[PDB]
Design a protein around this nucleic acid. Structure first.
Ligand SMILES: [Mg+2]
Ligand SMILES: [Mg+2]
Lengths: 257, 255
DNA sequence: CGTA
């Protein structure tokens, strides 16, 4: 019947761990948990963090130490786990997990931040290209798909507090926002906007200006589903009172047979 | 050529676990000035109080494990004063005023205002009491060296993140203006008369590689009265010494 | 991400 999925950029898993991540996790009780920015060598993580009771866990670390990484905890045996799009440039930064849960594929993606370089804005845009290709291929083969994670782009003006101030800042460039339009036009739905059309709804806030108190944030974290599957979506929400990282978690609930 | 070193040590027992004792003989100043001793000096090692070649002087706070200043000297002063004659300022282990005849040395751990409005207010009034003190000594004709942790970076050049910190104590317009007012009473920031570059810092946050990335503040200073500035040979930041969140700073004077 |  009901399956709950949570996505969370954790800005460091052992950092969030010292702040009581496990207490939060055991309280929230997702059936599947997607995490971005683990940043730790998974094989030397606390055992109580790798083996949480009732879950199987999967870590996909970057090649660079202390950088990126994603993880998934699941109560549902996956029938398959893939950790890349099959393009080495993109598959080495610890950004990709694709799990087969029979009814749907689950993509847990840490999409690149394009602020550091002109070439990281390029890397980002090309990761975007490669992701759309991958998901489209799986979808066109008859698979339902759920994509969650940190897209690193606010879509519409509704999705950041200062839209006009950032129109030349990565995360809100016309190029970036245009790809999300294109992504959607390929048959995918922004699930939060299926149920909530309000401004103010953010998932990231700068640590400075102490922006979170002020609610001066960006919606950088999304659950997307393919159109064909959108009737199984019952809930899509932001867990805005969950602290510990510069991102808050997002939740999805699907009703399934 | 007399060399003075000023170092906020974030605890004298914590830094003792690094070979501060080995640094201190591996780098032998005429006068060593230490801020934030954080310890009952009678429960400090015999070898930590009584160093060979040095008379040591500890000015501890009333509060346990808090604040405190120390001075190690080859030539002992003729007097040591430990307060401005203002009670709430004189009980926090913040003040050493040593008469070396040829000059007075102020070894001051200035309050930090970051924790509350009351402590910011306290830091600012401490700023006033000190200025009155040093103005009075300077007016009696004395040559004055003032060293230690001011807990304020004066100008944007003196910290890595001026913009996000302009509402943080350590970089308020009220704190920066007092450094203006102090200098304009006829006192000289010694470092800035030899080095005018950015990225010159004495403190770095422990949190987030800060030092290894050089995100720091210049919070430690050597100041002299205007008249006396002619005798300052060198003023430098000992950027590479470790074991505290502050690094040492150095002064070489001629006579 | 470094200001605690
Ligand atoms: Mg991050
Ligand atoms: Mg300290």
């Amino acid at each position: 019947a009901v399956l709950k999925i949570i996505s969370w950029n954790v800005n460091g898993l052992r950092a969030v761990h010292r702040k009581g991540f496990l207490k939060w996790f055991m309280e929230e009780k997702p059936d599947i948990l997607c995490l971005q920015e683990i940043k730790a060598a998974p094989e030397q993580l606390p055992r109580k963090l790798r083996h949480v009771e009732g879950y199987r866990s999967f870590f996909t670390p970057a090649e660079r130490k202390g950088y990126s990484g994603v993880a998934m905890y699941t109560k549902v045996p996956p029938s398959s786990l893939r950790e890349g799009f099959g393009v080495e440039r993109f598959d080495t930064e610890g950004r990709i997990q694709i799990a087969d849960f029979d009814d749907f594929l689950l993509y847990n993606i840490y999409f690149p931040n394009g602020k550091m370089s002109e070439e990281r804005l390029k890397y980002k845009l090309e990761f975007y290209d490669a992701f759309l290709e991958d998901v489209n291929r799986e979808r066109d083969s008859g698979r339902n798909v759920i994509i969650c994670g940190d897209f690193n782009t606010a879509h519409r003006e509704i999705d950041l507090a200062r839209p006009k101030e950032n129109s030349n800042v990565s995360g809100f460039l016309p190029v970036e926002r245009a790809w999300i339009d294109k992504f959607i036009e390929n048959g995918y739905v922004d699930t939060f906007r299926m149920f909530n059309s309000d401004p103010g709804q953010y998932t990231w806030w700068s640590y400075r200006t102490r922006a979170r108190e002020r609610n001066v944030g960006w919606r950088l974290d999304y659950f997307f589903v393919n159109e064909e599957f959108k009737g199984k979506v019952k809930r899509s929400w932001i867990l805005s009172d969950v602290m510990g990282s510069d991102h808050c978690p997002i939740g999805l609930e699907i009703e399934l047979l």
